């Protein structure tokens, strides 16, 4: 699935991100956006054979298992498939706990380059909250 | 099918340091985030801090920094250290994952003057 | 922090009764609030995570529910072993902080 932006917006509300550890809503569209475009089944093979799934972009070398990556301590205890549903519950459970650690968003290249330092609120202007 | 399992003194002086151990088994110490929280009697419950996966700790402000958590992936174990404790510190000691699954069933410390 | 306040302190109910506990946040905090159900001498037990997600092994008579700064466990049907004291805690800030819990006993 492809989200829209203020479908994605309302949608992480919901799944409580906003201010979540200090960061606002905005932050989190924009790391969708960056890090897959807001497509839930976008996948990426790592050049260390791990592999990035769902529309976080959650590598399989430390957060979910694919059963095709040697070292995957699955931080998240989920099959890496739950990540690519239309149902983002998995994704943002996994991310909570990601962002939980002591790097924070820190962890998604995207948002750190694209995001971090700018206007992210402006990724959920003009939506209703 | 996940165990935790606290262990250290039970009955300690003020001023002294607690240091307590938490075991784990049918889990990686080292694939996960570990935390402790207390229950002093009678009361309810207060986080104390967690460790995550890549060392980070964070402690609760009410412990005034003489808190340490840490972690022995050696022996699938984690600690807690608490400085200069007084009674205010006495209460039932509990160690869990973080997702809140898993608890250990807790150890009683005693700070008897 | 967070301060997390439960209501009521104490909860009479008769074996079979729907109970109904209720636990507010000082500021919003989403969807990131647990529950857990300790019982004498026991540790507290997960029941419910992110205000309504529910997990294997807990009766289907424990739901969860609400948003933002109101949130509530309600027990459809309850049963003698529910007599217990339950907690809220909140993950949206650290440090984490709990509800002072609502003591659930028989009536």
């Known amino acids: 699935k492809v989200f829209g932006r203020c479908e994605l917006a309302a949608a992480m509300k919901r799944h409580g991100l906003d201010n979540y550890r200090g960061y606002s809503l905005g932050n989190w569209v924009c790391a969708a956006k960056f890090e897959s475009n807001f497509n839930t089944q976008a996948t990426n093979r790592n050049t260390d054979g791990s592999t990035d799934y769902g529309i976080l972009q959650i590598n399989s070398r430390w957060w979910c298992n694919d059963g095709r990556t040697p070292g995957s301590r699955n931080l998240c205890n989920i099959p890496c498939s739950a990540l690519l549903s239309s149902d983002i519950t998995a994704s943002v459970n996994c991310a909570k706990k990601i962002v939980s650690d002591g790097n924070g968003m820190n962890a998604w290249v995207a948002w750190r380059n694209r995001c971090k330092g700018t206007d992210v609120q402006a990724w959920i202007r003009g939506c209703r909250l | 099918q996940v165990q935790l399992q606290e262990s250290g003194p039970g009955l300690m002086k003020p001023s002294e340091t607690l240091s307590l151990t938490c075991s784990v088994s049918?889990?990686?110490?080292?694939?996960?985030?570990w935390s402790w929280i207390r229950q002093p009697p009678g009361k309810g419950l207060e986080y104390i801090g967690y460790?995550?996966?890549?060392?980070?700790?964070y402690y609760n402000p009410s412990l005034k920094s003489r808190v340490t958590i840490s972690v022995d992936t050696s022996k699938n174990r984690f600690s807690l250290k608490l400085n200069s404790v007084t009674a205010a510190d006495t209460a039932v000691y509990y160690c869990?994952?973080?997702?809140?699954?898993?608890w250990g069933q807790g150890i009683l410390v005693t700070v008897s003057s | 922090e967070i301060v997390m306040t439960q209501s009521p302190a104490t909860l009479s109910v008769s074996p079979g009764e729907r109970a109904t506990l209720s636990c507010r946040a000082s500021?919003?905090?989403?969807?990131?609030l647990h529950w857990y159900q300790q019982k004498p001498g026991q540790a507290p037990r997960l029941l419910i995570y992110?205000?309504?997600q529910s997990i294997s092994g807990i009766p289907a008579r424990f739901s969860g529910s609400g948003s933002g700064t109101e949130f509530t466990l309600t027990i459809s049907s309850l049963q003698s072993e529910d007599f217990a004291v339950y907690y809220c805690?909140?993950?949206?800030?650290?440090?984490?902080?709990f509800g002072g819990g609502t003591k659930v006993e028989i009536k």
């Open positions: 460790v995550s996966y890549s060392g980070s700790t």
């Open positions: 805690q909140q993950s949206n800030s650290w440090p984490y902080t």
């Open positions: 992110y205000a309504s």
């Open positions: 049918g889990d990686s110490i080292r694939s996960d985030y």
């Open positions: 869990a994952r973080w997702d809140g699954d898993y």
């Open positions: 500021q919003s905090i989403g969807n990131n």
